[PDB]
Amino acid sequence: ACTKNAIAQTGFNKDKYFNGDVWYVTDYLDLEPDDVPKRYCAALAAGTASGKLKEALYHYDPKTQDTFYDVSELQVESLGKYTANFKKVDKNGNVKVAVTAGNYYTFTVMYADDSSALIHTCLHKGNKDLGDLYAVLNRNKDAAAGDKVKSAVSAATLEFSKFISTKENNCAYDNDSLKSLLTK
């Protein structure tokens, strides 16, 4: 179940966030913690491609090796809050599971600056959801969370101490495929 109406950043700069570059997940918190593994790797690219607002996702379970990419088209609900379709694709953009009405996520940018961000997502796959999932992002895959983003976590009435880090998982990312997938 998702339970939070996440508030977007006041004065969110959409062009900076959606610049075509990659964001790595450095820490995550699911309010239903059993919905996601204790060890995980994820990243995303966000940008406008031929006028269309897009996100490309990468997920990797470092223990099971389960791997998947997705291409998302985002619709705007309000500045910094989006509803995203998804299609599951291989790394080259070939469709494995097509867009369907019932497969979507909400996506809220709670805090961002040039190098870090705090987002919330609620994933729906038909009648199931993956709970309220918060993620701290950085442009640098190895960056420890700094004060701007940790303060944002506190301002959302969360505790960064409770987030699970992705840093000890030997996560390795294909940045080229994430960037290219924005066009797909």
Rounded CA-CA distance 20/36 in Å is 27
The residues pairing with 177 across neighbouring beta strands, listed in sequence order, are: none
120 is in an annotated binding site: no
End-to-end CA distance of the chain: 30
Resolution (A): 1.0
CA R_g for the chain: 15
Collapsing DSSP states into helix, strand and coil, what is residue 2? coil
Question: 3-state DSSP call for residue 29?
Answer: strand
Closest CA to 77 of 124, 7, 28: 7
Tokens 């919330």 identify what position?
120
Would you give the DSSP letter of residue 33?
Answer: G
Find out whether 55 and 76 touch, Cβ atoms under 8 Å: no
Q: Which tokens go with 157? A: 């009435």
Domain chopping of the chain, boundaries: 1-184
**Which amino acid would we find at residue 34?**
D
How many H helices and E strands in the chain? Answer: 3, 11
Q: How open is the CA angle 83-84-90, to the nearest 5 degrees?
A: 170
CA distance 64 to 40: 10
If we measure between CA atoms, which residue out of 94, 102, 73, 93 comes closest to residue 85?
73
Q: Rounded CA gap, 60 and 110, in Å?
A: 24
Angle among Cα 40, 32, 68 to the nearest 5 degrees reads 35
Q: Tell me the C-alpha to C-alpha distance, in Å, between residue 128 and each of 18, 101, 123.
A: 28, 13, 8
Structure method: X-ray
Rounded to an integer, what distance in angstroms lies between the CA atom of residue 142 and that of residue 156?
24
Spatial separation of the C-alpha atoms in residues 25 and 60, rounded to whole Å: 11
Task: Classify domain 1-184 by CATH architecture.
Answer: Beta Barrel (2.40)
Tell me how far CA of residue 127 lies from CA of 102, 104, 106, 130, 176, in angstroms. 8, 11, 15, 10, 33
Q: Where are the beta strands (DSSP E) in 34-176?
A: 41-49, 52-60, 67-78, 81-85, 87-89, 95-97, 103-112, 116-125, 128-138, 164-165
- The span from the CA of 184 to the CA of 167, in Å, is 29
**DSSP state for residue 13 in the 8-state scheme:** -
Q: How far apart are CA 120 and CA 76, in angstroms?
A: 15
